[PDB]
Design an enzyme around this catalytic site. Sequence first.
Site, PDB file in Angstrom:
ATOM      1  CB  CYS A   1      -3.907  -1.161  -1.782  1.00 37.41           C
ATOM      2  SG  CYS A   1      -5.086   0.154  -1.602  1.00 37.41           S
ATOM      3  NE  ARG A  15      -1.154  -0.480   1.566  1.00 38.24           N
ATOM      4  CZ  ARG A  15      -2.251  -0.531   2.318  1.00 38.24           C
ATOM      5  NH1 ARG A  15      -2.154  -0.476   3.638  1.00 38.24           N
ATOM      6  NH2 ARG A  15      -3.455  -0.631   1.750  1.00 38.24           N
TER       7      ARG A  15
END
Lengths: 329, 324, 324, 321
Positions: A1, A15
């Site tokens: 991530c 994100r």
Amino acid sequence: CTSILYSPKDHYFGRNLDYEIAYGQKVVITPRNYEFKFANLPAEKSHYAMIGIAAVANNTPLYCDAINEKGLGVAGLSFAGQGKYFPVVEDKKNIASFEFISYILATYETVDQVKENLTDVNISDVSFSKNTPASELHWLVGDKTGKSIVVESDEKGLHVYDNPVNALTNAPLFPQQLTNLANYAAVVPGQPNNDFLPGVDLKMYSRSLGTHHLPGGMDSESRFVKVCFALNHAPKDSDEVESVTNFFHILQSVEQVKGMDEVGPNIFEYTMYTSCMNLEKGILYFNCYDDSRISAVDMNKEDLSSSDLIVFDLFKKQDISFINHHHHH
Amino acid sequence: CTSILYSPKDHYFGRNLDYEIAYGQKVVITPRNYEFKFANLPAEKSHYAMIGIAAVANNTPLYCDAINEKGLGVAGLSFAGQGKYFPVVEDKKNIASFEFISYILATYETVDQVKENLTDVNISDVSFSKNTPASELHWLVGDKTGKSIVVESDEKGLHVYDNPVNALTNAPLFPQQLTNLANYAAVVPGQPNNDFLPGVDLKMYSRSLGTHHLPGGMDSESRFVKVCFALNHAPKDSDEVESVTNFFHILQSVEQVKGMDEVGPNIFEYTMYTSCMNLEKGILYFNCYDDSRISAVDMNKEDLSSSDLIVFDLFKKQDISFIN
Amino acid sequence: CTSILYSPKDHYFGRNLDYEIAYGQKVVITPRNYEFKFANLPAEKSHYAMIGIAAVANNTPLYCDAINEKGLGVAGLSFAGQGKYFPVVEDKKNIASFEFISYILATYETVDQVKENLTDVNISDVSFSKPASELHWLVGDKTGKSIVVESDEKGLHVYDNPVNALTNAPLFPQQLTNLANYAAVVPGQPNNDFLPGVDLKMYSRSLGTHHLPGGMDSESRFVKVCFALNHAPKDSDEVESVTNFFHILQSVEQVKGMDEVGPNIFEYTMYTSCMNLEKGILYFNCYDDSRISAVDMNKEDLSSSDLIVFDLFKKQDISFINHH
Amino acid sequence: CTSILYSPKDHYFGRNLDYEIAYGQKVVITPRNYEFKFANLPAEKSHYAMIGIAAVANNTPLYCDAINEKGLGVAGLSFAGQGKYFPVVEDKKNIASFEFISYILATYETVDQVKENLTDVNISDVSFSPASELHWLVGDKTGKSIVVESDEKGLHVYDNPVNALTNAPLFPQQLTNLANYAAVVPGQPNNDFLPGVDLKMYSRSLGTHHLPGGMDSESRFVKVCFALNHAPKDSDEVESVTNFFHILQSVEQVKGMDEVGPNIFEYTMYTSCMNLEKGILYFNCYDDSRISAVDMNKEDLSSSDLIVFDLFKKQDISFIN
Ligand SMILES: [Mg+2]
Ligand SMILES: [Mg+2]
């Protein structure tokens, strides 16, 4: 991530979620009077409204990343092998890892507040589902000041770090991420001046030879270094749609394509979705691996005095615009 | 720029065009009976239809990349500082650089045919418009066999290379691009076995440490190495929408974002558009820096017996779907 | 600086000292009955004999690296910007940073003993003049194991050292984490799992080391020396072992001009020490003298009471083969 | 292998020989009246004297690297997988690969002269006893050098702007790869990486964090070009020799790091440093760190016999007691 805070004029927080399997994530608005039932904290029946990506189980939002109506944002990022949670204790404020986003956004307005008010917090080992372990996470917290902090619970306890580069990925511990960043101090977007072999005429055969050692790997440190660079050099003073476009391109620069990150035989970690949330405006923009088109949900177009979760689809199929059709005339 | 041939089931051919300024590019279908007038070649009043991205000047398509109705594809990629063109010569077949895509797609069907018939070719220094230089280019050529060739005219003349990795970027010369790949032969998508410090337990703290030295630069070699890797490891056996989605992600892996490739103070080379053409179906899919949504034009929904260029907008505004 | 523990048969402990200024280092043997006077520890008039590289000031050896007669070795390495020393406090055993090598080698025999007895230690901010240099230490012995001792802003830490090497910054756990970034390095040729199905041009030997670091910075030297040490020969006799030891540190030597620490000021490898722990022999050379020299501690009277000093820095000792 | 031409004041020419097996190499002086029996060229009984490293078989110096009495230097470096030699033909000057150093140093004085005279040369496939695949670095007291490569496309001569050479790939490709390191600096870079961010400049020389330390040919080439370019200038004899050995030591191959077979390793067998002005050869080897020196001009160069000294030596330890 990979998570970033991008401050061209308005402030944008969001994100990439990179993983090998989805967990029923949706777009979820939690209004002011949805009652939060926390494992070891008093229930909050009135609080700030928030919007983000979450799974929903037993009428409970399990946020992945979100912002609240006051312009604070929190993203949880995988921290496997580095994170540690601790048993509930009578003399700390116990926040379970799966409720950290909800509780922080329900209660707090600024990064400065979060930093001063984590001094007596314990990130507990409580899980949402009995007989199932909590996922190991750390968090980026950012706000409309354009500043961010990193929150990490590790074997030495809970730490809060000022984040000079407004980005976060996965392992290693945050101070170690910053040390590795300086290994790339010689990188430049254009052509370096020749202090490598002074007096020699190098064959400057390609543009941007100064990024020849910029990392492109799928690992956590490679994505951290590259997204720091892409974020720092991104355009500024842009309006809303141009800002959003630039934001998605920053995170696309560290996108994980199927095949390149093998986590098991024929099992791949890839960028499942990308979220972009305008802190000033309460709008969540998003796309996913299967749909390149950007979608938007405005929290402020809903009734924020209500009490039920408001849920929209996150994962979509490729939304192709057919320019051409059969010529009837 | 970066171009690839992707063969999951159908075959897909296309490219990122990375530059600092657009050149009036649009989607252009050239139908079978548009008359091509070439500088030093017979006119072609009848030929294969084609679809691709082109500027149009003086009712002439100036193709950047395109495919024809038989499933042959050609992409022209910047080759500044390496390409060399030559004066027209009587003992060669002279193709001007700007007509190369049009001519090859109008005339041939397969990579094999192209290779056979380039043996006597000179890439000439003729430009399309008076008083403007021909851009320096090299070309990727691919077809439905899943194989491709690289065509490069440099100071040693014309060269045709088999392309084992089905990708192309900019400089250096193609054999040099291939040698540089071996510098990355230890890269793996997962975790390497520890033959680095045998007997030591290394802290394998992240997934995919096998890609820690995979290049992420904006320069031509970095993009070549990385796109070769992304293409090689891409999914196969996909249906149409899934294949197109994966194609765009392959080229997205080497996208040039504004700010990262500086070609002058406050002047940046970035990925202006991305094209993806289905060789079997004659469908062109595209998006651009400003519009993430994928658009599609099907060549076979147009009148291919026509004689006029058929043109569509390429560059678009961001097409956001407002949900609530 | 780079320090290692090498265990081919006997055990060898030593280091490169890389810096831009020399400080009067010599070869110094401290016999058993030289009286140590420490700043906050009881005086030691009888103790272990040691041999190493030191500056001598006021009849007092300021060791850079040394070994004692029992086969324990300690090397001090620059740790600028990372080290922190602390005021003397009554609750702790206070060792000044410049006394650390002298005290540990005077008092202890093994790495295990050093570890057990550092648990209440504070590295004090006491200087030798009136500021101490920031250091951290490698401690090794004839078991072939080593520890790293660092005093930083979080206090005193002792780490087991799985790679038996140490350079400068960053903190030791970070040095270990960075090693995993090189897990795919091999001394030979990697297997091609980078582009499966493509035959790569394996044009050079040892393409597996193409991403091995050669920089002069602390992390590059650490990664490379860990590799060179791990892969060095074993089962060697004395001279062959010493030769291989010097080559390992040579692999990360700093040549004048490559490490610029100021305008026309360069950090370079000033000397290289190699000490046989079993035998008490110090071997050394320096930037200006390639020939190896040897001082045997046990050829001296170790019951004596005075420091025994030899020259470290020497001119190039060239063997002229022909004459006249 | 790594070869360099170093020009601090006098000019120094030499190399590392990196390989897994020795081939009877020794120090060999070939005097002016040694009769060269070239394979397909007329014999030469009067020529320039030369000194360097060679094997000797059948009273024949098989040079690895050498310089002549006029300040010309030639080093043969492995080029396996890239080099190509060609059959002897009637319309070229055929020079066998194993006699190239001998012929060039016997015959010519400067790099310019060599360039002019290679125009019609064929590097032939004739072997002394097959011939090992080589390419050559040629340098002289002008401080300039050339690279001589015979490959698939024939014989090529390149000006060498970096005065260094290793092994594969072809020389223009080596120069292209050099430019990939354009951002390297010996000290700390200016912060154009992340402007407005205070980086943790935790080590000296973070500018060299991407400098190659590999044992492969391209790594050694880039590193030695950097080490050579930044080495001290204006040094005297012993200072220059010392600096020269350190430049090559910056790319030396330690046993264990370059695996070429099962427990078979390529390492730096010897290092030569030849003063072009003075005709002195300096050397050490993997097993002897002490530098030794042979001066060509202390011998009778009007001789006809080869003058030979040992190259490989035991570690020469100075025992201080
Ligand atoms: Mg308590
Ligand atoms: Mg002929």
